[PDB]
RNA sequence: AGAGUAGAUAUUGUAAGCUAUGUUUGCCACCUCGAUGUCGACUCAACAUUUCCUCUUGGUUGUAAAAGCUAAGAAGGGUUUGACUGUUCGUCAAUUAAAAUGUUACGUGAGUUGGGUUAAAUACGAUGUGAAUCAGUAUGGUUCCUAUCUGCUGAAGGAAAUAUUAUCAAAUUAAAUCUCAUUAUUAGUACGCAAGGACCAUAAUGAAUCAACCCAUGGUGUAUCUAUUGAUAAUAAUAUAAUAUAUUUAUUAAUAUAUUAUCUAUAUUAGUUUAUAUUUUAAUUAUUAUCAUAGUAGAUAAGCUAAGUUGAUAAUAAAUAAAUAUUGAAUACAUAUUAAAUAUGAAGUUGUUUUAAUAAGAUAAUUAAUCUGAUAAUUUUAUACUAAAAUUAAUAAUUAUAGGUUUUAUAUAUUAUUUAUAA
RNA sequence: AUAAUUGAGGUCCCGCAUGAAUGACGUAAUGAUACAACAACUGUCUCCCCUUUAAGCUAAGUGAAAUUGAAAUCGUAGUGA
RNA sequence: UGCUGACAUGAGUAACGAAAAAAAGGUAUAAACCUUUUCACCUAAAACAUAAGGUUUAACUAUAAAAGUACGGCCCCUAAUUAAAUUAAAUAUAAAUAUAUUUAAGAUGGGAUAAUCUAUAUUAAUAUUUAUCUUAAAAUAUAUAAUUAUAUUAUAUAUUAUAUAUUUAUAUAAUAUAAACUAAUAAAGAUCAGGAAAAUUAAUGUAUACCGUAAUGUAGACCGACUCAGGUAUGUAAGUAGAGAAUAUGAAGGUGAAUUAGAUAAUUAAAGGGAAGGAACUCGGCAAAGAUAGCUCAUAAGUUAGUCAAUAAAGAGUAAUAAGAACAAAGUUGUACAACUGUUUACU
RNA sequence: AGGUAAAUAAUCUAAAGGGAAACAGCCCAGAUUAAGAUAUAAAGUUCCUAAUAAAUAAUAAGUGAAAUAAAUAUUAAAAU
RNA sequence: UCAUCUGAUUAAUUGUGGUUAGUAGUGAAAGACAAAUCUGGUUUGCAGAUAGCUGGUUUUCUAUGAAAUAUAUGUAAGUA
RNA sequence: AGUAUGAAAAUGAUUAUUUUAUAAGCAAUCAUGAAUAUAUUAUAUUAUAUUAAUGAUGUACCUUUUGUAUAAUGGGUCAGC
């Protein structure tokens, strides 16, 4: 149930790193994407090209934003009177800074 | 009960409902991204549904047709955005696949998602129309788009097309009128080139497309095999 | 000594005598006295042999036969299910070839149980002035731990290879395995006054155990099909209504589809809900879905299972234990040798058999327009992850992994009052 | 009563060491109390099998604990606080 | 088992605390955030109102708007009760202080008027519980100087027509639903005998204080060392079912969560099913199994006479004939002991 | 009885070294620091493991070879 | 926690507030409770209680070097 | 819980040297090859240093004890106290 001794430096290290099962393997199965000449996984789509195509689809197949007439044709002063500004909470501010906590996809290296 | 399908870490009732939802989403949005295992199971359902629809369309037996219809109805959630999904299935989706013997979907593997390391895939409908009757482009048929992008890249590099690319193009063609296919390719080029910011001289592009079509369409050792002495 | 008809040594064996043993009741306090494994059960057994049965064999006026009695070798295999009891034990029932005796922290819980003995409540008999007490009896009553090391069970990777690889593999080693019963014949024979009643040996059953398998059988089957109850939410079809196109037509009827909708409002003496009139366009059949433990129920493909199926107890042979002999001196004789020669003889031994581990050896190729592997993809015969194995065809050629499809088949449950074509 | 019963009920009374408000004896009713008997039913068992879900196992993220003289930490016999 | 600090080991291990997810897009950034759509779970609630509590946790700093009538506080008055208070010499006492009396405090309670809106001020005088039965009456059939018949039975409202006043005013008769439930009413059963305490007109006023107000409240916003399956007061609480707030569903609403994705070995938990047996288990039928209306009948022995026994057991009709929601419903008898209903070791 | 009660001697206790396989107490022997030639002690000298060769008996059982198990039986052997 | 079992108009259950506790209240009586637990709470103080008991007690070198007996001891784990 | 500074240790990763995949225990010492490192008198056949070829011998410390490797006791480890 309980360790009888302080496990030594040797014995913890040979346990962890000695076996190949536990080690990380080289990703030999990279290959060139045909659409953009960059690294991608074998039997896998290029995340750049499919992302680009998804973006294209979004730009074309776009549901139009609903702008109400009455709010679109307000005067500036009138709009200010109706819908004044406010102090956002700390939480709200944190939520707003998305680049702090949201990871955009990185581009791979160009294949040789 | 063991081995017939993926369990997907869900109770039976939940699992089936999930699969139905996935099928509905596939029919609505002609491609969808999800986890690999879910996609694989969803394909099985969707394909089955498509075949049933085809059978209903074709069969002379009225009772059979009615039964097929009932089965199709059972296998979908018809509400909200999928109210008129049955109609779409009969009129829009299933008529694409009348000549095609199975294989209506394609699950294309993606790079696994970063937060979770979950293997990610794209379940999508085969031979989805890239251009509707309105002057727009349609969401779906990712593989075709990728192929055309690869072709464009090859043209830019002034390289020959890869054998695999040609094979893929041939596969795409098999259930496609040649002129229609060409027109689709041209349409894809217009969007793709602009996105990538390469110049679109139209006549030259058309000629290239034609050349690509021609080679696709017109079909043309270490050990020796010797009889026993 | 004494039994044992007649005889101490067939079997019996006092008192004393000499040992062994290291199981028990002690005795000692030498271990820790932060060793419950708290004494019994269950799970699991391992080991001894001081043999219960089973195999071999001596004696047995107390071996006719059969039962036995007794002793030798022998541990290969096997050695039980209940009633009561906390029980070990025992009695008892029914069995079995037999129901051995132990050791293993009175084998076994960081594996279980917790009934007993066991703290706090408690009462009973007895004791004490009393608090309380008791080898008493009794109801009740809390146990933990994710394994670090060793060990064991499997499984990989690395590796040094009498130096490659693919593959085929032997000696061996590590294990396993090893039975037993009953009836039948031999035979109512031997044997006996009958009454009984065989050895040797062999076959057939079975038993126990192990192993494999899913064709059938049974099971399960949150695959699936059918049946059914209660609410609910759909889709469709139609009726209706309205908006938007189209359009017969002349904005508007109409025609067509598309969408959207099926409300709502007011009575009926406080409120609520329902009911009906009122208001309004405010719809009546197909088919679904979810929930109700898979909602419940009848079936049920595969798979896996055991109630099922199949196989097996691994010969022959080698030397042997005990035991039974031949010739034969030393030692005229005699003596199976603790002389030389010469023989038999065991469920034991060595082998055999089977499983796994290894890799002597073998055939084959050798820098690759196609060398051997590995990563990657699709999976399964295989599986925790791995490992193993199938496939990665698309080429003039020749191979289908999976899904899908398709065909046949199965399931479900209706069905000839049918299915489809005439003309 | 069971095939067979150290339990149970009835009964007997050399009452080790019962006995009358520390109340005696006997009923009905009640009891999550205790013991025993019957029926019914069962995966408790003969004998386990199958299936569902949550883990367990693998990948990604975050990330404990008791313990620990130092450890290059096998078997057996003997040995020795 | 020294103390403080730092850092190790176990170990990248166990665990990530009841759970339903999908997609598409925000956003060529999202398992985890927002939006839309589908699916699901809660629904006498995971809903809507609230009380208490609290790092304001909120739909936030440009912030939780009150003269009063279904607003509370404040305020007036008290209960339990409290009080360096109170009363030559209130009484008693090592001191502290204590007691008795007064007096001031003390809400969990009492407290004026009001939508045809309402006016609190100053001054002068002078209700423990519990029931709503019966009977009788009014009414529709019978039948039409009947018997039956079954329902009606105190209240609240609009309408119509009057009638009285002159289109208000009020009376008067006239028609007008089932089920709940509610408030004012009345009359009424028992023993366990059911709080306290704060004028009247009339005259004259009354330019309306302060304070709570978010959200959270069966919980991630209080108590539990944690965003902790514990604890936490109140009224509501679609419909359809039913005796019912039981049980099913769930319109609307509100959720889907600080772990996911695969996988589903052995193994454990939580379930479902099981051939032939049928308690052989075992300390012991522990656990599991077992329900032939739930309604209406019918219901023994015994006995303290109490359908106690008894919801008896069995049996019956309504339903059902192969079966085909949930939920209540789980046999009988002997013995010991205790009469009973209760209480007790909050954590053996 | 590794018992217990003293007596006596020694060691241990508080003593490192050599021997007795290992070894608190037995057999030797007492470390001041070295060193390592010369005597040795106890104990040993086939190997492991420093170091040997002989005589003479007797044993045949591996008795035995650093932890001697008995009454008794048998077969021998001497002697009287 | 779940499954189950039990009371469920009463010796019922609970909200707001008050009273009684550290020689000490409350207790349908169990040493039960009095703020995660009492044969008597907690804090502070006495106070460095007291410990014939247990543990700890730190550099070096040098020289000598014990005893575990007798006696007495409310003494035999101590002390003379 | 001052301000600097900080090659203090424990501890993490990495590399370099060197050893290690037929060898079994306080992990050291001694013996002894070997490899490497540095060296301004290595003249060298040198020196030193680092280092688990290799062989021998070697039962942690402390407390407490008639007596401990002890499976009696205390300590995870370092720094401060």
CB proximity list for B185: less than 8 A, separation 6 or greater: B148, B151, B209, B212, B213
Chain B interface disruption, residue of A50, A52, A64, most B CBs within 10 A? A50
Residue B123, class by beta-carbon neighbours within 10 Å (0-12 exposed, 13-18 middle, 19+ buried)? buried
Going by C-alpha positions, the residue among B107, B143, B137 that lies closest to residue B33 is: B107
Q: Cα–Cα–Cα angle for A85, A90, A93, nearest 5°?
A: 65
Nearest CB to A60; choose among B137, B150, B152: B137
* Under 8 Å between Cβ of B54 and B98: yes
Query: Which residue of chain B is at minimal alpha-carbon distance from A58?
Result: B139
Nearest CB to B136; choose among A40, A47, A60: A60
* Under 8 Å between Cβ of B209 and B184: no
A87 DSSP assignment: P
Residue A6 CA to its chain's centroid (Å):
42
Distance CA B156, CA B51 (A): 41
Element (H, E) at B109: strand B105-109
What does the longest C-alpha to C-alpha distance in chain A come to? 79
Please report, rounded to whole angstroms, the spatial distance between the CA atom of protein residue B154 and the C1' atom of nucleotide E91: 119
* For the segment 73-132 of chain B, residues whose CB is within 7 A of strand E: 77, 79-82, 113-116, 118-119
DSSP-assigned beta bridge partners for residue A110 = A38
CB proximity list for B78: less than 8 A, separation 6 or greater: B85, B86
DSSP-assigned beta bridge partners for residue B34 = B121
A49 marked as part of a ligand binding site: yes
Distance CA B71, CA B91 (A): 17
* Under 8 Å between Cβ of B18 and B38: yes
Distance CA B5, CA B3 (A): 6
């Amino acid at each position: 149930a309980v360790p009888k001794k302080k496990v030594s430096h040797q014995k913890k290290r040979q346990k962890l790193y000695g076996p190949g099962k536990k080690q990380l393997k080289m990703i030999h199965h990279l290959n060139k994407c045909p659409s953009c000449g960059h690294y991608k996984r074998a039997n896998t789509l290029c995340m750049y090209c499919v992302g680009q195509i998804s973006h294209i689809w979004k730009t074309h197949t776009a549901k139009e934003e609903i702008k109400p007439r009455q709010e679109e044709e307000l005067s500036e002063l009138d709009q200010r009177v109706l819908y004044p500004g406010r102090r956002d909470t700390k939480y709200t501010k944190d939520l707003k800074d998305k680049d702090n906590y949201l990871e955009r996809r990185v581009r791979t290296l160009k294949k040789d | 009960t063991v081995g017939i399908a993926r369990k997907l870490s869900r109770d039976k009732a939940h699992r089936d409902a999930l699969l139905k939802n996935l099928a509905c989403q596939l029919f609505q949005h002609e491609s969808i991204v999800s986890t690999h295992a879910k996609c694989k199971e969803a394909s099985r359902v969707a394909e089955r549904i498509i075949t049933w629809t085809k059978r209903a369309i074709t069969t002379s037996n009225s009772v059979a047709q009615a039964e097929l219809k009932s089965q199709i109805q059972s296998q979908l959630f018809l509400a909200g955005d999928n109210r008129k999904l049955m109609k779409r299935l009969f009129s829009e989706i299933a008529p694409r696949y009348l000549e095609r013997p199975g294989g209506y979907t394609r699950v294309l593997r993606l790079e696994p998602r970063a937060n979770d390391s979950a293997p990610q895939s794209v379940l999508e409908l085969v031979d989805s129309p890239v251009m509707s009757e309105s002057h727009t482009v349609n969401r779906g048929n990712l593989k075709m788009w990728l192929l055309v992008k690869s072709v464009i890249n090859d043209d830019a590099n002034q390289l020959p097309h890869n054998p695999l690319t040609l094979q893929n193009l041939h596969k795409v063609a098999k259930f496609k009128a040649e002129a229609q296919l060409h027109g689709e390719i041209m349409l894809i080029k217009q969007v793709l080139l602009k996105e990538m910011s390469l110049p679109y001289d139209e006549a030259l592009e058309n000629e290239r497309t034609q050349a690509l079509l021609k080679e696709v369409y017109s079909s043309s050792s270490s050990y020796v095999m010797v009889p026993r002495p």
